[PDB]
Symmetry: C3
Subunit: 241 residues, 3 copies
Amino acid sequence: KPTQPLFPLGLETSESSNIKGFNNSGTIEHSPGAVMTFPEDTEVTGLPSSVRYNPDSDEFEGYYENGGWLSLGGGGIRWETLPHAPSSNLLEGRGYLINNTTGTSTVVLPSPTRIGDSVTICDAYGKFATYPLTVSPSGNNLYGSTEDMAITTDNVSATFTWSGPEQGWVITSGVGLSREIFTQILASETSAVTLNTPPTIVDVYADGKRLAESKYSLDGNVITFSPSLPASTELQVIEYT
Amino acid sequence: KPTQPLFPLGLETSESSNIKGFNNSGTIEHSPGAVMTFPEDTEVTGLPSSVRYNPDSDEFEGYYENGGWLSLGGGGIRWETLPHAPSSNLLEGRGYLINNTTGTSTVVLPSPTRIGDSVTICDAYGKFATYPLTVSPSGNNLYGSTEDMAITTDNVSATFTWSGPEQGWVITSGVGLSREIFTQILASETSAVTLNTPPTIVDVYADGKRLAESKYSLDGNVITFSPSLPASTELQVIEYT
Amino acid sequence: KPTQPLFPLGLETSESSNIKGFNNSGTIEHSPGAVMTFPEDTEVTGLPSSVRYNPDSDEFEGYYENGGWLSLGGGGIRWETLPHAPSSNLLEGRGYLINNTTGTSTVVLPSPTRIGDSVTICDAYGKFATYPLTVSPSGNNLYGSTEDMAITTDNVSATFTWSGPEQGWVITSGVGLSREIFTQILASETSAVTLNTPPTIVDVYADGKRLAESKYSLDGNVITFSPSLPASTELQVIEYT
């Protein structure tokens, strides 16, 4: 029957021992000066409730049922300063306090591993209006576009997130998220006009007066108005974007 | 005096042993291939510094002083895709990448357990303008209202949070958070007018001209103006909301 | 050669034992009713993969390579209600559900320890328009200013973050982030006018008519217009901020 020594009252040990681990069936306390640690492991293999340190991702992880080796404690924000460099490259789960006082800097998103992989940046100097920041998604696309994206808003802060490859990167958490006037004096009596870029909504002024909603229809980047206007007429148009 | 065997130089063990736990008073290292794990426990009972895995909430938790069994590592974001379904039900601490390309989908917030319980959603397809999303709070109320709430903004992302039952759910973290023109030609000489919904602020135009702030007062969904206006007068009103 | 007892088949122990720790080289399972725990430690000294509980910060921490003793699981949000008090003081990593129904309350940011140190607040009652909240940064400055900051927006929620001492505190995560009309009838024929505060952009109306972009230039808090206007002229100016 019994296969191995048993110690009714347990026992004591006054030096570091060497085990091939075990199954605990009771309570694991500590005394002062006691230390603890995790296996420095790197594999993709594991089983739920199993836990490790990682000496590459410098991140205390735990194997979850759906997925496996997530960061322990869920999602989290690694707040570090970034010393201004023309180009910088950013690591998942880290958030960067950017300075653009020097001038315009760039940052390159990492290659996404898992969905959720989440990076964060913050205009902590409020310099982005004066000296913008651009965001290189690398091979993988951002909001569908492989093309980079620029940031122009003093004081802004954004969390980027991998959504899968079609839409690629997107913004999840964040903080901090165009007055056209075409005017001229009709050389002739004219029934239509074309604005330099399509406006969403527009206000029209004919001489002094504010023209009525009925007097025109607006479509794309052109404005018809019945009745057609006479020559010598100062018309103001306020393209809204 | 002594009650149990003592091992001056500690010892060695080349197989998995079986303990009723203990109190460590020194350093707990590991060698390569070493593994670690947590008790698969489910109770509400525990004591600070005590820690576990949970085989229901699939979440590495730790008993804190104020509260008890929180998720270890504080609050975190479980980023998963959601395959479009007319109805879906959402789990705390998880964040969902929603698609509404198919059409309009719905999601039901879980029953809140603790205050803080925090869910997150994201229009990762930018389809919410074209095909909105609605948010069922279930029995418990949202911002005071038991009534559901709809979302209409292309590209949006929101973190919901339980605040307690009076106000119920609210939005904490998030990203991405109405041109009325009444016009007519006064049949008669008229001293007042009623707008179809109360405007907050309004611009008034009488014939061509932009009427002065003194000429009217505005209240609720009606506009008085002294002096009272004459008949045959084209007046434009720009309800702002 | 051998220095300490070895137990080929490992062994068993039916009571809590007392160790000076060890190096595990195998697998550390558990049985039902098994418990676990961390050393209640307080020092700044430690080595990566080492982990502890803290009986002051009531926070399960782990020593990371760059930095040392971070909270395990990265950044996280400690959601608690705050019972309205004229003054309250706030702890890092905690997020407060504020009520200002009573009246105007204040909150004092803690002294920042590490960069990243991140506090969060939320107008969960939507009372901030009616009864504002103010934010004392203490000695350390907020966005450069040592001067406090007030909050006026019903429904808002903000994450504060320590960036370093020059800019001090800033806002990273968050949710929820001025109609001047000067009018008069020119006593005389006047070529310039001064607005009570500099406007960014402005709309000008002369009698009824909306004046053209060419007719004036705007600078600081003054408006020139060529040609200079005649006396008896009702002019409206819409300061935009």
